[PDB]
């Protein structure tokens, strides 16, 4: 969930 | 002449094991020696089993270390990593260097493939570039590695039955001969086959779709079934997306995803896993938590970001 490129 | 250097490597490795980076100099040489070995390798690498397949590591050096505790060490056990060595972790450098160091050394005991992150642009947006900066003062190590990446084989086939790749399937690719044709020696494109093999994901929506990521597509079960049959494949081994359980089966156990970076980014909280393919291609999964981190020194105040 950190940024879609991937948490 | 042989040992003359083979000892130089053997040491480099042992140093890396202490998680101590190699010098800008050494990195350049290690990579040189590396290209020469990686060129000879096809885009669809032929790896004979037994071997253990590993997924994402994302510079989490220690968990990589834990990984070896779980599946054995090189070269006593044969490995296969499906890209994504750098970015996110706090030790991308050590991680990648060590893995590459082993390839140069035990050339037939480990197999490294390219990942969506073994790209100049991503490494620049997701860490690696900066880490190399703070660990070397300039951009040379970064260049030297990103350059080596290009020569990484895009895929690998295990015992003619298992297809291993970082990303996924491509509408631009139907047979393994297709991949073989491709010219991989170049940065990962924003569009195309090569890019697909590196960014595609399996979807629960059946049939080619639009990747919510921004690259590659989202293939469905039918697509997997089709592909496997057309090439004589029993398994599509890939990993490119966090699976809170270390590994996950999809598309009627036709494709399995395998992540090896526990508690990814030190946040996610997933378990990691690896897959062992024995003397006779038998599945077998080993899950594991992130190793325990220990450090009693005085956590000082880091040197300014404007230093240099």
């Amino acid at each position: 969930x950190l940024x879609r490129x991937x948490x | 002449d042989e040992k003359v250097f083979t000892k130089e490597l053997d040491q480099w490795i042992e140093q890396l094991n202490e998680c101590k980076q190699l010098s800008e100099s050494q990195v350049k040489s290690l990579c040189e020696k590396a290209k020469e070995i990686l060129t000879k390798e096809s885009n669809v690498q032929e790896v004979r089993c037994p071997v253990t397949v590993c997924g994402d590591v994302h510079g989490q050096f220690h968990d990589l270390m834990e990984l070896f505790r779980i599946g054995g060490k090189s070269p006593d056990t044969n490995y296969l990593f499906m890209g994504d060595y750098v970015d996110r972790g706090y030790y991308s450098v050590e991680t990648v260097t060590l893995l590459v160091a082993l390839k140069v050394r035990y050339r037939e005991r480990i197999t490294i493939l390219r990942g969506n992150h073994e790209s100049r642009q991503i490494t620049q947006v997701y860490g690696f570039y900066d880490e190399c900066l703070r660990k070397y003062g300039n951009a040379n190590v970064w260049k030297y590695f990103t350059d080596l990446f290009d020569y990484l084989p895009l895929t690998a086939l295990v015992d003619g039955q298992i297809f291993c790749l970082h990303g996924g399937l491509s509408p631009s690719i139907d047979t393994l001969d297709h991949i073989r044709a491709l010219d991989r020696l170049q940065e990962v494109p924003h569009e195309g086959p090569m890019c697909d093999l590196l960014w595609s994901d399996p979807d629960d929506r059946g049939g080619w779709g639009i990747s919510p990521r921004g690259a590659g597509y989202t293939f469905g079960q039918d697509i997997s079934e089709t592909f496997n049959h057309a090439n004589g494949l029993t398994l599509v081994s890939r990993a490119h997306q966090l699976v809170m359980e270390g590994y996950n089966w999809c598309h009627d156990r036709n494709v399995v995803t395998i992540f090896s970076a526990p508690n990814y980014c030190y946040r996610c909280g997933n378990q990691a896993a690896i897959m062992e393919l024995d003397d006779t291609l038998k599945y077998s999964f080993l899950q594991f938590d992130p190793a325990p981190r220990r450090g009693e020194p005085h956590v000082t105040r880091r040197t300014p970001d404007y230093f240099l």
Binding site: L2 | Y90, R120, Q121, Q124, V125, Y129, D130, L133, R134, A139, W142, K143, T146, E187, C265, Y266, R267, V299, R301, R302, P304, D305, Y306, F307, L308
Partner: protein
């Protein structure tokens, strides 16, 4: 009837002491949610204008509910982490709090409710303990603090000093001791207003604040968290007084990130914003060392940087400024723009660069050619000769 300034001054003390520990989910008997939402609606909906009797038990009530010692963080150490990616931790028992805040707010933000009331029951100590609270519950709690402090600042001239001083302390400790605090952003927003509205001729102290506290703040690793809120203050400061421009720009360069591309772009992004308001007569004092830097950015192997810098060229006001002084600037950038743009791994900057060179010609043909002349020449010798 008219016996409320004893019923309320009791309906409150009920909510005061209270302090129902919400870390076990037991004793589910509200009670307080009433007395609170009650004392609110009792002062909001035209329910009063005469409830100013001498009773600052409102403060004490608030103090005993809010002034607790913030708990140990539930987020990781640092260095290997990014606060931007911290898991938001909500203060359990927000309900009671929320109301205590919301109430207290409307409390002294109502007419008839004078300052000289609190002026003696809202001392530095109150302020101080209030500041500490600026530390963890998602905006939810910080936000209220943010607003609460703002008004307390605007209503007591006999406090403004302290509020400011203390905030500087909260900042110094941030910059030079523990490179961690959870509400710099919120605190900056408050300051934004404060800055924007000083004496026409800036008082010595305020300049110091900007230089010894505001600028050195760009220094920290967690800038990606309050960058915008900060830049605003930096700009707002320049608009108040342009003089402080040279020192400001100089400082930013002084602190220019060398191992943090993100912050780099942030700097670049914050620099344009300063140029947009840069007074012509001053674009000069900075001009040279600034561009001397931009030339280095454009050549950066880091696309995002090179790019963001290159983008300075679609800004009319900057291009304007670069023209009115093209003489000194062009020779600074040129060597980096004319530099074989065919080298980059990112087949997108060459064009980006070209666009920039181009814009220079349509600004002064002579110079350009003259610079190209020099470049080509010097490049020959150093090549003809540098080959033995």
């Amino acid at each position: 009837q008219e016996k409320l300034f004893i019923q309320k001054l009791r309906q409150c003390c009920v909510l005061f002491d209270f302090v129902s520990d919400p870390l076990s989910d037991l004793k589910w008997k509200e009670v307080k949610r009433a007395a609170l939402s009650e004392m609110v609606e009792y002062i909001t909906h035209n329910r009063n204008v005469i409830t100013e009797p001498i009773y600052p038990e409102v403060v004490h009530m608030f103090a005993v509910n809010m002034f607790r010692t913030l708990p140990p963080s539930s987020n990781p150490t640092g260095a290997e982490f990014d606060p931007e990616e911290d898991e938001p931790t909500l203060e359990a028992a927000w309900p009671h709090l929320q109301l205590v805040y919301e109430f207290f707010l409307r409390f002294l933000e109502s007419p008839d409710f004078q300052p000289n009331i609190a002026k003696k029951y809202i001392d530095q100590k109150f302020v101080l303990q209030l500041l500490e609270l600026f530390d963890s519950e998602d905006p939810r709690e910080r936000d209220f603090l943010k607003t609460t402090l703002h008004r307390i600042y605007g209503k007591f001239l006999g406090l403004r000093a302290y509020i400011r001083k203390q905030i500087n302390n909260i900042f110094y400790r941030f910059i030079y001791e523990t490179e961690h605090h959870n509400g710099i952003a919120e605190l900056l927003e408050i300051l934004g207003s404060i800055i924007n509205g000083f004496a026409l001729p800036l008082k010595e102290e305020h300049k110091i604040f900007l230089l010894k506290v505001l600028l050195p703040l760009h220094k920290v690793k967690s800038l990606s968290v309050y960058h915008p809120q900060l830049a605003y203050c930096v700009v707002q400061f320049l608009e108040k007084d342009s003089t402080l421009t040279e020192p400001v720009v100089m400082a930013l360069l002084k602190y220019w990130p060398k191992t943090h591309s993100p912050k780099e772009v942030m700097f670049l992004n914050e620099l344009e914003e300063i140029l947009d308001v840069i007074e012509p007569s001053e674009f000069v004092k900075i001009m040279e060392p600034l561009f001397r830097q931009l030339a280095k950015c454009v050549s950066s192997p880091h696309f995002q940087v090179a790019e963001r810098a290159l983008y300075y060229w679609n800004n009319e006001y900057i291009m304007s400024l670069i023209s009115d002084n093209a003489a000194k600037i062009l020779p600074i950038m040129f060597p980096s723009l004319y530099r074989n743009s065919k080298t980059h791994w990112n087949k997108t900057i060459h064009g980006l660069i070209y666009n920039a060179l181009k814009l220079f010609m349509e600004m002064n043909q002579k110079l350009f050619d003259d610079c190209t002349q020099q470049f080509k020449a010097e490049k020959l010798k150093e090549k003809l000769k540098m080959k033995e």
